[PDB]
Amino acid sequence: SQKVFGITGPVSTVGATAAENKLNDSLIQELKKEGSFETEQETANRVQVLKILQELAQRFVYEVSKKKNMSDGMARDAGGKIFTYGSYRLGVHGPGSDIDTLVVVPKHVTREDFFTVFDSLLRERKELDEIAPVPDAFVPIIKIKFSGISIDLICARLDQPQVPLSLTLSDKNLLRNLDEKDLRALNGTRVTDEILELVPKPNVFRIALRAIKLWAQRRAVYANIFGFPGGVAWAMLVARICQLYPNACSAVILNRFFIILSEWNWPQPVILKPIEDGPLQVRVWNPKIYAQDRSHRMPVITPAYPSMCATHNITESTKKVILQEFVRGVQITNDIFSNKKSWANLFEKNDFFFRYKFYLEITAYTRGSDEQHLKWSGLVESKVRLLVMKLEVLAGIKIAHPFTKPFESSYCCPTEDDYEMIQDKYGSHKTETALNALKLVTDENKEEESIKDAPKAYLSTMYIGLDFNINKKEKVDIHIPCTEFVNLCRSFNEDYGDHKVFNLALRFVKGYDLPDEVFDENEKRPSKK
């Protein structure tokens, strides 16, 4: 009831002034200019797509229930229901945004049914242009594009005979007798549903969140895999501030959001309500019981039972960046509120590739199918974080800052020799021009009877910016951490040791000698100081 004001009640209950609303109006307007919002039309399409999927979910269940020899009535009554979660469910999605979707089915519908029956029902539709089923994923999923709109579909199987249209997923007992995959599948929806019910004024929250997502992206502090808060974390952080200021407008919320998160007594958790127990043998976030939990540095806790920490990955170095960025938020928003800066300023692109003197490139190379490369580089990427952690503990390392995005390229690679060379010359601007000799495969140039044919080599590169501690005279030695990292890129139940195909290289590089790929059309690379 008072749940909407969070665990300490409001900080202030005073509503917005006119001067505040004007600055809110210009925010929404900046958000519009920046293309946060899709038109009413493309939202209308989204709604219609889910309708069709809702119809198909009901059909799916109906058909399976007929196969188990229920009557017509019982098959209909068995129901089946579509829920959204993540960005779309929250009202913060953008023009290109995927809809994260969950199909809920009664006890007698398996996921083997989902990957056969539901799959073939999807294939029947004219609106279906692409479908990628991935049964053996950590969460089993079907990725589709439907009427140009991207949908991610997951399946949850309840311990219940029927899933009526009226079903909401908020009751704890919906979790009884579920296996871990099903348990996991329910969580996304229950979490985002609860955030929505834990917020005083949802439209105010929606706008504040749109602002935070843009900022986080542009300031390069949005990437879970690399040790920054992802979407749900940011959503919950924004939700927390909304509770402290129930009547504030979004402009004000952003202001108070940067001040409070920058003065937060970190590692004390941000929580949207008191963490709860339940009847199940499932791990709840609990720093008292679990050493892992205790080591979280900026914990942001999901509210749906099993409460979990949505920022496990944050490292000492990423917390430093996040905190700098909040402190920057504090100065810019106060300036906006003083008529001295615009919102455009807050959303100014980061300058990661100008801010340090040295960088550590980490490159995954593949000479093979792009499916092989996806796998190989996906593996390498997931460890970058672990490298950050080994480096950041070292005496001479002031910070190890991972950038939040890989740099992808690919070349036609007719021979083994071309492949040695790509490996040799790539990554330094001194030698980078050597690979113009090899046709650079372009997002805009993929003539299938020429380019999309030749044996191709793929590169993915992550960058860690470095700051050293140096009034001391010595060679800074970081080979152990780099070597340990390499050995972490270990072939689990698949092999990457055939260097004729996969490779891994790290390279230490001075700022001025950074690869071109790293600078935009409008950026001029730095030079020898």
Binding site: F468, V476, H479, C482, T483, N503
Partner: peptide, 24 residues
Amino acid sequence: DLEVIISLGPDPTRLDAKLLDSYS
């Protein structure tokens, strides 16, 4: 000109994973 060692190879600023065992 700061010296930073990331590998024990011929080029201390370059670590190629397949050569790792041939360095040390």
